[PDB]
Enzyme design. Structure first.
Site, short mmCIF file in Angstrom:
data_model
loop_
_atom_site.label_atom_id
_atom_site.label_comp_id
_atom_site.label_asym_id
_atom_site.label_seq_id
_atom_site.Cartn_x
_atom_site.Cartn_y
_atom_site.Cartn_z
N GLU A 28 4.69 1.72 8.14
CA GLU A 28 3.21 1.41 8.55
C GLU A 28 2.37 2.56 8.11
OE1 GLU A 28 2.38 -1.19 10.65
OE2 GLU A 28 4.69 -1.86 10.86
C1 LIG Z 1 11.87 0.81 3.66
C2 LIG Z 1 10.43 0.54 3.41
C3 LIG Z 1 9.97 -0.60 4.46
C4 LIG Z 1 8.54 -0.92 4.31
N1 LIG Z 1 8.24 -2.26 5.03
C5 LIG Z 1 6.99 -2.69 4.75
C6 LIG Z 1 6.98 -3.83 5.24
O1 LIG Z 1 7.89 -4.55 5.91
N2 LIG Z 1 5.92 -4.55 4.95
C7 LIG Z 1 4.81 -4.11 4.16
O2 LIG Z 1 4.05 -4.90 3.66
N3 LIG Z 1 4.97 -2.84 3.80
C8 LIG Z 1 6.08 -2.19 3.89
N4 LIG Z 1 6.36 -0.89 3.41
C9 LIG Z 1 5.47 -0.29 2.66
C10 LIG Z 1 5.11 0.99 3.11
O3 LIG Z 1 4.08 0.87 4.15
C11 LIG Z 1 4.30 2.02 2.11
O4 LIG Z 1 4.76 3.64 2.75
C12 LIG Z 1 3.22 2.07 1.66
O5 LIG Z 1 3.06 0.90 1.02
C13 LIG Z 1 2.71 3.07 1.01
O6 LIG Z 1 3.79 3.59 0.07
P1 LIG Z 1 3.34 3.43 -1.38
O7 LIG Z 1 4.76 3.50 -2.19
O8 LIG Z 1 2.90 1.93 -1.93
O9 LIG Z 1 2.27 4.44 -1.78
P2 LIG Z 1 0.76 4.54 -2.18
O10 LIG Z 1 -0.11 3.75 -1.32
O11 LIG Z 1 0.77 4.00 -3.75
O12 LIG Z 1 0.55 6.15 -1.97
C14 LIG Z 1 1.13 6.95 -2.95
C15 LIG Z 1 0.71 8.49 -2.47
O13 LIG Z 1 -0.92 8.58 -2.48
C16 LIG Z 1 -1.29 8.73 -1.10
N5 LIG Z 1 -2.59 7.98 -0.96
C17 LIG Z 1 -3.07 7.12 -1.48
N6 LIG Z 1 -4.19 6.64 -1.25
C18 LIG Z 1 -4.59 7.78 -0.44
C19 LIG Z 1 -5.77 7.75 0.16
N7 LIG Z 1 -6.83 7.18 0.08
N8 LIG Z 1 -5.90 9.12 0.49
C20 LIG Z 1 -5.05 10.09 0.72
N9 LIG Z 1 -3.81 10.11 0.17
C21 LIG Z 1 -3.83 8.80 -0.34
C22 LIG Z 1 -0.27 8.34 -0.45
O14 LIG Z 1 -0.34 8.97 0.99
C23 LIG Z 1 1.00 8.82 -0.82
O15 LIG Z 1 1.36 10.14 -0.84
C24 LIG Z 1 7.87 -0.20 3.40
C25 LIG Z 1 8.19 0.72 2.64
C26 LIG Z 1 9.62 1.11 2.72
C27 LIG Z 1 10.01 2.11 1.75
#
Ligand SMILES: Cc1cc2nc3c(=O)[nH]c(=O)nc-3n(C[C@H](O)[C@H](O)[C@H](O)COP(=O)(O)OP(=O)(O)OC[C@H]3O[C@@H](n4cnc5c(N)ncnc54)[C@H](O)[C@@H]3O)c2cc1C
Ligand SMILES: Cc1cc2nc3c(=O)[nH]c(=O)nc-3n(C[C@H](O)[C@H](O)[C@H](O)COP(=O)(O)OP(=O)(O)OC[C@H]3O[C@@H](n4cnc5c(N)ncnc54)[C@H](O)[C@@H]3O)c2cc1C
Lengths: 591, 594
Positions: A441
């Site tokens: 989330e």
């Molecule tokens: C096992 C697993 C299960 C998941 N389940 C689901 C699910 O069922 N459905 C679903 O839709 N998603 C799901 N997710 C996605 C999950 O919510 C992710 O954590 C989310 O998509 C953000 O991670 P990302 O890798 O896309 O990072 P990004 O959004 O690309 O973030 C990369 C980095 O940049 C930082 N960052 C980005 N934007 C900002 C900002 N504006 N200000 C400050 N810092 C910022 C983040 O905190 C992070 O450190 C899942 C993830 C995993 C790993």
């Protein structure tokens, strides 16, 4: 160590500290569905199913993981059978709307059930959590036709839910999603795109899976104000409710993960998949507002649940493992060495876990109580104050319970020494599982930015003052005995208020200050909130002291929290007060 | 995804050793080193170590984790490519880089072999531990074995043709080696027969070498009870003929290997000795003492293993943070031609990156400082100098072990968290580094045991004199600082004052109150750690200020120093307050009330 549901602590928090049965009796919406007796029988059954059917599958589930065979995903051995028992028991719809066959338990009860299942087996627990989440969004925003076609089977756990948000290039920044929804003459939409990291996107627990998919119409605006939400079933449903044609979607693959290996994490491909709009065009994010309030607390509870499971293993081990002698001299004269609980550092680690678990459990119940007030109160001013405390406190529950859960699981492993590095003891898995809760989330960094940005700066601090006013009224009420805890609590509240005033001033015209403060400020808030939780539990324990050893245990745990954990606020406050300047001295090329 | 390519941090390593510590000016006035090492010799070894670690070891890290070791009827096999990569490594002289040139080791001082340890451990921790064992085993044999055993075993061990193992731990005996039960029966031929089971033996059995030379803790039949009855034996996997060729397989084997959180390519063996032939090392009943020198070096070594995981995590995180685009900078969109900004623009991402950077660079400096004390202790002609160096080794090695590994863990957690959800996915390599790093906090003993050593033996045990030696040096440095260096020296002096007051509080509070020592231990060691890092950062700041100009390296170093001082050094206050609470809160409950 076998999982045992902490029902005695759960009774203490809900029935003795918060006295929630008093509140239910006043609310005729809940007076119909739950009383103390009903709640007690629900928890006893949940404790039985979680310890007996779910907990035994945790270790073998991690070791086997999920399998992908020509688009079909299989969970570990025994997961489908355990899911069927769980669902037939009514556990998927325990907090569900009775208008569509749910049990209608308030969040203070369904949140305890969530802790039990997630402690027993986090991978298992996330599966019904998806379905319960998807139901919240469909109940709040779907048309009567969609609600009537899908909610009954979802509250019964016959059909699962999924949240299909994340894309390869879009997690935090959902405004740039590429998945498209093409309007059809028949009123439906054809969804085309690729989603990643979709928990339970495909599995063998249910005959159907109802995907909530974020997509944009072809004429949608750019950014988050172009986002829409769609109900896209894995299997289209015939007019008569039978399963029909497989939808034009599939799981291309599952991820190789650090942890929750029994949680199928799916690349989901949609090729003109048929779906239906939920809510209004361009208001897809608003369609998830309620769902995400509840999900933020639910993710906190997942982190806490891994900490609780680690403590149960650690205390049993610390009483059985003998090594060296107590510093004040041999304690176990009949043996070659003393149980490791005699050692100061072992007690430090155990008590850190215990104080964080019990404080986190209290805070989870307090936040659940705000959600129930927001939902069930007949008084509009009461509902609105509860809504503001939900908005303030859910990000704190999300990030703080998961960050404290991680520390808790690490202490739980470290107590075992080198044995904790061995998988058969289960402690290393709980660390790996707990790490998922800090990005599930969304990232904790985004939760902390929401707290300082929208909930603190955005309300001029007013939302925080609703919370700290309640704490100060508590302090003003304290007798001399409770002063042991109320006095340092008041000092902690003053520290948080001064840090809040520092931040409101420093953030004016300096956007970088907000993100710079965010995570460490959220921690100061968290330790301050746990001081309030611990003072509330100390008040009850002081009143009942001598009645039962439980109350002596509670007060010793409270005293550890205030003596060794609460002082964590001072370094965090100083780091925040350094401001953003030292974060921005270097250009990206200088890193 | 992919674990980013490892690149040895040679520019930083040159700054720390050549520019800050000026190690060549120290090797000048050290006759035994003048012969074997200088700046150019040292630079050429580092270039070579960087090529082999990046080229042949690093590419095996991820697949090694995914395959792990196998056990087949007592034979243990490492992952695909490990034997071939080990052969290359050993034939390059890397197993004996710090070994005694009298038996064919390269004789590099610890400041240089510590840098090589960082490179191999960053590239592949499971790999790097194997030669680590052999080097440690050699230290013990060189220090305490007879001429006959040294002559027969050390040459192959320095060449890496024969591996070493440390066979200490038994099911019931980990921290408390005093209660071990493995038996050593004297034989008429001057040998002993060893019988017993050891567990958690790293490289107890594997396919990297034709022989393994086990250092086994065991007790003679007539030995005293407790640790005063413990002796050390050299027990080879395969007995060696006069001519040095392999004779009969010794009477020992691996019963099983462990299923672990991490370092999965590191075979962790249950070793069964069934009347195995071996020979006494050092003296009967002084087996623990025969490992004292080996454990001083190993404690720094384990610190370096934790730091290595952190450095590797940073390399992957900074590449990702510059490439991954998500959301817009708070002060307004930066990448105007793109859909989103590189995540490095976000305050929280910079905080996590700078925490890793300052802990990695601080730790690297502290590891080189401790290595410098080990070298001074070994090589100085001046008894006053040697003695003081030994005292700082005694004080600082437990800090190196527990602080570099604790900070390593935090560093790897930040490195994973920077990736968000992507960081949870094994292909990116960040989650493995967290799992590998966790081993360092229980390798060569738990961190809590290191912390207890620091406060119990090195602080209380010395009446704080060892600490006052360290802090005397820091205050002389502060007294010397010009106006510009005052930016750093002023808060350093305040950190030193805080540590000295906490030390005085602890010496008083521990009197007649044994629980106070263990209660203070871990958090006190962290206060010490952040104070020590403040000292390292002020030393690096002084050099960077002096050289600030056309080399942007010095600007980067000062910006990192400034983050350490603003955001990490303040961690000392809460830890000091927690320590000052004392043991009372820890003993309010009886075991039954937990
Ligand atoms: C096992 C697993 C299960 C998941 N389940 C689901 C699910 O069922 N459905 C679903 O839709 N998603 C799901 N997710 C996605 C999950 O919510 C992710 O954590 C989310 O998509 C953000 O991670 P990302 O890798 O896309 O990072 P990004 O959004 O690309 O973030 C990369 C980095 O940049 C930082 N960052 C980005 N934007 C900002 C900002 N504006 N200000 C400050 N810092 C910022 C983040 O905190 C992070 O450190 C899942 C993830 C995993 C790993
Ligand atoms: C992967 C791995 C590889 C290993 N490789 C080797 C090897 O090659 N050779 C070898 O000899 N050993 C090896 N070991 C064993 C290891 O070095 C230590 O013996 C082990 O980490 C100690 O943990 P334990 O499980 O034995 O804990 P215990 O010693 O049983 O301690 C349990 C807990 O009690 C605490 N404790 C115990 N005594 C005290 C005390 N007096 N004061 C305070 N706290 C105390 C500990 O800190 C810990 O939290 C290895 C271990 C692992 C996990």
């Amino acid at each position: 160590a076998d999982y045992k549901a902490p029902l005695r602590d759960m009774r203490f928090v809900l029935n003795e500290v918060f006295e929630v049965s008093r509140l239910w009796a006043q609310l005729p919406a809940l007076a119909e569905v739950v009383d103390a007796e009903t709640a007690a029988a629900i928890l006893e059954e949940a404790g039985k199913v979680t310890a007996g059917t779910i907990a035994p599958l945790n270790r073998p589930g991690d070791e086997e993981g999920c399998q992908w065979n020509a688009g079909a995903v299989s969970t570990p051995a025994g997961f489908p059978e355990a899911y069927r028992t769980y669902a037939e028991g009514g556990w998927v719809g325990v907090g569900g709307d009775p208008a569509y066959g749910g049990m209608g338990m308030p969040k203070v009860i369904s949140a305890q059930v969530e802790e039990l299942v997630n402690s027993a087996n986090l991978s298992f627990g996330l599966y019904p959590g998806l379905t319960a989440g998807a139901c919240l969004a469909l109940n709040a925003h779907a048309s009567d036709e969609l609600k009537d076609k899908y909610l009954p089977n979802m509250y019964a756990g016959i059909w699962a839910g999924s949240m299909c948000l994340t894309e390869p290039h879009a997690g935090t920044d959902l405004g740039i999603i590429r998945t498209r929804a093409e309007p059809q003459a028949d009123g439906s939409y054809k969804i085309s795109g690729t989603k990643i990291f979709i928990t339970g996107g495909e599995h063998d627990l249910t005959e159907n899976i109802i995907h909530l998919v974020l997509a944009k119409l072809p004429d949608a605006p750019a950014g988050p104000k172009g986002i829409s939400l769609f109900l896209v079933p894995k299997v289209l449903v015939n007019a008569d409710g039978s399963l029909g044609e497989k939808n034009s979607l599939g799981c291309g693959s599952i991820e190789h993960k650090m942890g929750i290996k029994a949680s199928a994490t799916c690349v989901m491909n949609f090729d003109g998949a048929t779906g239906w709009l939920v809510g209004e065009v361009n208001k897809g994010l608003a369609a998830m507002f309620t769902m995400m309030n509840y999900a933020r607390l639910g993710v906190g509870i997942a982190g806490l649940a891994t900490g609780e499971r680690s403590y149960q293993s650690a205390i049993e081990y610390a009483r059985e493992r003998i090594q060296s002698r107590a510093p004040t001299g041999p304690v176990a004269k009949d043996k070659a060495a003393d149980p490791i609980i005699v050692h100061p550092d072992v007690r430090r680690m155990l008590l850190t876990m215990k104080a964080l678990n019990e404080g986190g459990r209290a805070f989870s119940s307090y936040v659940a109580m705000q959600l129930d007030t927001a939902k069930y109160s007949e008084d509009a001013v009461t509902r609105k104050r509860a809504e503001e405390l939900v908005a303030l406190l859910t990000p704190v529950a999300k990030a703080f319970l998961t960050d404290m859960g991680l520390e808790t699981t690490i202490h739980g492993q470290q107590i075992f020494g080198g044995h904790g590095f061995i998988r058969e003891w289960g402690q290393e898995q709980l660390v790996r599982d707990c790490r998922i809760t800090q990005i599930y989330e969304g990232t904790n960094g985004i939760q902390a930015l929401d707290l300082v940005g929208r909930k603190v700066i955005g309300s001029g601090g007013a939302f925080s003052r609703h919370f700290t006013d309640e704490i100060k009224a508590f302090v003003a009420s304290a007798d001399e005995a409770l002063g042991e805890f109320s006095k340092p609590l008041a000092a902690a509240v003053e520290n948080l208020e001064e840090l809040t005033a520092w931040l409101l001033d420093r953030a004016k015209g300096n956007p970088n200050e907000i993100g710079a403060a965010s995570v460490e400020y959220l921690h100061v808030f968290g330790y301050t909130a746990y001081a309030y939780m611990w003072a509330l539990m100390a008040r009850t324990a002081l009143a009942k002291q001598g009645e039962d050893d439980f109350y002596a245990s509670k007060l010793g745990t409270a005293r550890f929290y205030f003596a060794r954990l609460l002082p964590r606020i001072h370094s965090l406050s100083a780091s925040v007060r350094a401001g953003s300047e030292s974060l921005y001295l270097l250009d990206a090329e200088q890193f």
